[PDB]
């Protein structure tokens, strides 16, 4: 069912540190690594194989303290064998000593694995040092594991703690990735056929991606395109150059579309199933067009000229950089620009001010500082050059003439 590949030193160190059941292990191991290096998988399979009483808890799902402590207590009570409620860490220690004394759990090491452990430090100051010292406080032969993506130096509190043993799960290289990806075989073809497909896939995608999950998902998606020449009959299994000539422009187009999730995976499968050309659609992006009223269009153009242009050139452009981001402007400058670009009388009615504060709620503008609300004139223009240039083309206005010389 579950087999671990290229993780042999790590399994050796973990199984050595666990020891026998009645032996005492470390109070805390902190495992760190990258985004897919078998942190959850190796630990969970290794604790399932050796038949060790363990509780696996995610910290993203438990966003409060009470949820985390009650999850640990209920899972341990399920292992030992209704509802135990604890509000504080003190009652958690007392009830944890209460539940562990059962006949199954007296003389073994109980494991509490905590996944996504970079969310514990945001909870409360006393929670992480309490879990680092849980063997000392409870005196009940307990090991606590911390699986994380952040290094340990970012975890240390200001007052110090008990130091865990810090372990590192190394990255997979290209040989390890090729060995892992070529194991869940498609049974209707041979082994070396799928191995050559994985070889050309990693030949394309290894520069930009080293994640096993994304590469496996891409290998699942692009495989019927690779094996349709042998279905049609133009090629055979031994004609590697024909297969790679077929697959490599498709793989260089899949990087721009599906890897960035513009065209969805189901849409991609439907396009190659229906034989429609890839990249024939807009996708989620390239739909940058919003339908605005007239005065909202000139308020947005006036804000874009207010934000990306210095105040010293205002009188030269209007009366008669693109790097470094926007520059904030006051409301009076916005209204001066707005009355200068519109070639008609504009009354300062309530709806124009409602438009100015409603463009903020649509995230097309952003107020900065928030010092005061009514007498707070600070605003920023958080939108790009192409969107504004298309709007200025809609209202027949030349934005490049007024941005810079």
């Amino acid at each position: 069912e579950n087999v671990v590949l290229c993780r042999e030193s790590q399994v050796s160190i973990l199984q050595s540190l666990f020891g026998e059941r009645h032996h005492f292990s470390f109070p805390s191991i902190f495992i760190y690594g990258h985004t897919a290096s078998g942190k959850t998988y190796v630990t969970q399979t290794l604790l399932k194989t050796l038949e060790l009483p363990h509780v696996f808890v995610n910290c993203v799902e438990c966003f409060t303290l009470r949820l985390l402590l009650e999850q640990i207590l209920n899972k341990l009570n399920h292992l030992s064998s209704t509802e135990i409620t604890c509000e504080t860490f003190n009652d958690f220690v007392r009830l944890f000593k209460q539940v562990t004394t059962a006949e199954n759990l007296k003389d073994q090491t109980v494991y509490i694995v905590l996944d996504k452990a970079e969310y514990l430090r945001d909870m409360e100051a006393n929670l992480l040092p309490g879990f680092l010292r849980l063997q000392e406080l409870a005196d009940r032969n307990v090991t606590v594991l911390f699986l994380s993506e952040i290094v340990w130096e970012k975890f240390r509190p200001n007052t110090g703690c008990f130091e865990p043993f810090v372990l590192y799960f190394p990255d997979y290289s290209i040989g390890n990735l090729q060995k892992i990806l070529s194991h869940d075989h498609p049974p209707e073809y041979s082994a070396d056929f799928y191995a050559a497909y994985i070889n050309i896939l990693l030949g394309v995608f290894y520069t930009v991606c080293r994640d096993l999950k994304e590469l496996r998902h891409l290998a699942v998606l692009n495989f019927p395109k690779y094996c349709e020449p042998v279905v049609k009959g133009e090629a055979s299994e031994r004609d590697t150059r024909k297969l790679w000539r077929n697959i490599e422009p498709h793989l260089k187009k899949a990087m721009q579309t599906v890897y960035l999730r513009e065209i969805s995976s189901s849409q991609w499968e439907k396009l190659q199933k229906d034989d429609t050309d890839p990249g024939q659609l807009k996708g989620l992006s390239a739909h940058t067009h919003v339908e605005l009223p007239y005065y909202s269009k000139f308020i947005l153009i006036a804000a874009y000229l207010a934000s990306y242009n210095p105040a010293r050139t205002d009188k030269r452009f209007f009366l008669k950089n693109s790097l470094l981001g926007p520059k904030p402007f006051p409301l009076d400058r916005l209204l001066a620009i707005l009355y200068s670009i519109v070639d008609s009388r504009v009354a300062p009615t309530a709806n124009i001010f409602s438009q100015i504060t409603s463009l903020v709620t649509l995230q097309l503008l952003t107020l900065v500082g928030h010092d005061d609300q009514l007498d707070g004139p600070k605003y920023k223009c958080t939108v790009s050059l192409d969107f504004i240039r298309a709007i200025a083309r809609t209202v027949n206005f030349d934005i490049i003439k007024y941005l810079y010389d």
């Binding site: 007239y294 009076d332 709806n351 438009q355 649509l362 007498d375």
Partner: protein, 594 residues
């Protein structure tokens, strides 16, 4: 009673036996003309407003049907996978418009359809009451139960309890307003429990869909299966609601060209919103039933003649002073003038005839407008307008043949080939067929004869002269018709200042020209109130300003009162948005500069 060291004063009518309440419409009788007529006017207003509201909701539930069909197809196809069996969460990016105020009604139409077709478990969440993850999840779970420190496990327990197969659907109405963190946490928590809790997410988006990239990074947007949808345009729903609320004879109330110009300018320029247009028509209807005493006749025509039969003696004299009625008796013969002025029964009968003439004028005018729309829509380059509302405005302000713009439309209309003219005649004969009880019985037979006939140029100029003579006869402004004041509303300015006001113009006019509001020779081009002279003095170190104010007030008029007048007229100007202190001088600021 209204001022102690507390900011709230609750008052109750307790300890006295006045439990009875005052009924509504007693406030409608502020001007005494007749005691009975005002009650009938208020009932007519309520009836017409309920009819217009029901017609609007029927119209809006009609228009959104196709998008609902595509979305139900997506939901069933996406849940077929969980019916078979980590997967991605199925999401639909429903791109609503910028017209935010409409969206709630749209979501109502979206909810019940799903509750009839896909799931019985539909919930709607808003970002105003989800600041963090605990409030988000607490608000979600209770709306799940009605249709303790709950978690994500309580949701799975409730689902396993109630099913023992349909999905749950969560609609998040506004993507701009949610916090990033609660969205990321909800996606990450809900994705790993997809095997025992099937979740489908609809994302209500107001702007372009790239806002999904703005709030969610690539590490979290890879846990979703986004399929994009688009909703109905604001312009199409606007044209539909004018065609089914103003260009129909079913509703007797109409509005003048200037009021329509006011509402279309606050629609197209300021904000697309049909609910604001409906609110403008409600206020127009309310002030028309308020100001006009003989607007009780603005109802359905048999009821209108029944009301004409029974009136008071003053109401007949109110009919006699109408300007259209005055011009109408001016253009008649001599004996008919004293026949109408003296006897009121002949007055009642003649007004009964005139309302029916106005009603058949309205019917003929709307059908000829619908027929002219086909000609101007088939013709390219669209001079008068591509929309029915633009055509209705430009024919409503003045007759189109007096303008020289219609001659160019006719000249372009002579240069058409056979297939286009066949298409025009088919569409226009369909227009005549669609509206039954025609009073234009001859023209339907004429256009069916023209369609039957298929020297092409002579029949082409014949059909051009046919449509030209048709718009001579029946396109006609309502200001040249008798008793149109019964069923029309022309108060453009009051409606405009009630809906779309300008406080800074009012403050500037009051400060700069106090003679305008105080006509006692206060200004022609020193004699002013204190705030109005201090404002003109500054448009700013305080001591020199106080000496200038003292010079002006002693020129105009051991006291030590005038300096306190200066303190009050600066503190009052500072309570407004004009004066803000600054540390570079004793004061140096100019917040208006306009």
């Amino acid at each position: 009673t209204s001022s102690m060291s507390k900011g709230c004063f609750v008052f109750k009518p307790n300890s006295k036996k006045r439990k009875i309440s005052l009924p509504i419409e007693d406030y409608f009788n502020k001007g005494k003309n007749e005691p009975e007529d005002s009650k009938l006017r208020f009932e007519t207003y309520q009836l017409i407003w309920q009819q217009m509201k029901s017609e609007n909701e029927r119209l809006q539930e009609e228009l959104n049907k196709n998008l609902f069909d595509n979305l139900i197809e997506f939901l069933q196809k996406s849940h077929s996978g969980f019916q078979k069996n980590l997967r991605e969460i199925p999401t639909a990016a429903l791109v609503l418009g910028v017209n935010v105020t409409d969206h709630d009604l749209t979501f109502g139409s979206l909810t019940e359809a799903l509750q009839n077709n896909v799931t019985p478990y539909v919930v709607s969440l808003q970002a105003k009451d989800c600041p963090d993850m605990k409030h988000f999840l607490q608000k979600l779970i209770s709306q799940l139960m009605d249709c303790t420190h709950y978690s994500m496990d309580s949701l799975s327990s409730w689902y396993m309890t109630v099913t023992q197969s349909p999905p749950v659907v969560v609609i998040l109405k506004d993507m701009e307003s949610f916090a990033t963190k609660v969205l990321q946490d909800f996606i990450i928590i809900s994705s790993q429990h997809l095997h025992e809790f099937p979740l489908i997410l609809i994302f209500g988006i107001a702007t372009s869909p790239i806002i999904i990239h703005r709030l969610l990074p690539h590490a979290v947007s890879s846990l979703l299966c986004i399929e994009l949808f688009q909703s109905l345009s604001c312009k199409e729903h606007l044209t539909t609601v004018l065609d089914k609320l103003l260009l129909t004879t079913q509703f007797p109330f109409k509005i003048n060209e200037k009021v329509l110009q006011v509402l279309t300018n606050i629609f197209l320029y300021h904000d697309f919103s049909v609910q604001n247009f409906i609110k403008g028509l409600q206020l127009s209807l309310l002030e028309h039933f308020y100001s006009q005493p003989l607007s009780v006749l603005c109802c359905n025509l048999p009821e209108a003649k029944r009301r004409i039969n029974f009136l008071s003696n003053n109401q007949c004299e109110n009919i006699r002073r109408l300007p259209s009625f005055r011009r109408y008796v001016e253009k008649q013969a001599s004996e008919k003038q004293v026949a109408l002025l003296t006897n009121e029964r002949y007055l009642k009968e003649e007004t009964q005839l005139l309302l029916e003439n106005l009603h058949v004028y309205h019917m003929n005018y709307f059908l000829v407008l619908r027929c002219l729309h086909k000609f101007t829509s088939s013709l390219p380059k669209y001079p008068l307008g591509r929309q029915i509302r633009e055509l209705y405005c430009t024919c409503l302000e003045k007759n189109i043949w007096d303008s020289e713009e219609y001659a160019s439309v006719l000249q372009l209309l002579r240069m058409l080939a056979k297939d286009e003219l066949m298409t025009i005649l088919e569409k226009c004969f369909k227009v005549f067929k669609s509206y039954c009880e025609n009073h234009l019985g001859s023209t339907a037979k004429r256009i069916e004869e023209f369609l039957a006939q298929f020297k092409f140029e002579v029949l082409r100029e014949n059909v051009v002269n046919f449509i030209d003579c048709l718009v001579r006869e029946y396109l006609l402004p309502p200001e040249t018709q008798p008793l149109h004041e019964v069923v029309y509303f022309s108060a453009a300015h009051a409606l405009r200042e009630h809906l779309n006001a300008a406080p800074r113009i009012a403050l500037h006019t009051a400060l700069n020209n106090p003679y305008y509001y105080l006509k006692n020779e206060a200004l022609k081009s020193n004699i002013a109130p204190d705030i109005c002279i201090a404002y003109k003095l500054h448009l700013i170190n305080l001591v020199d300003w106080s000496e200038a104010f003292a010079t002006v007030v002693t020129a105009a008029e051991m006291n030590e009162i005038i300096h306190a007048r200066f303190i009050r007229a600066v503190s009052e100007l500072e309570l407004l948005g004009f004066i803000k202190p600054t540390k570079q001088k004793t004061d140096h600021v100019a917040r208006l500069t306009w």
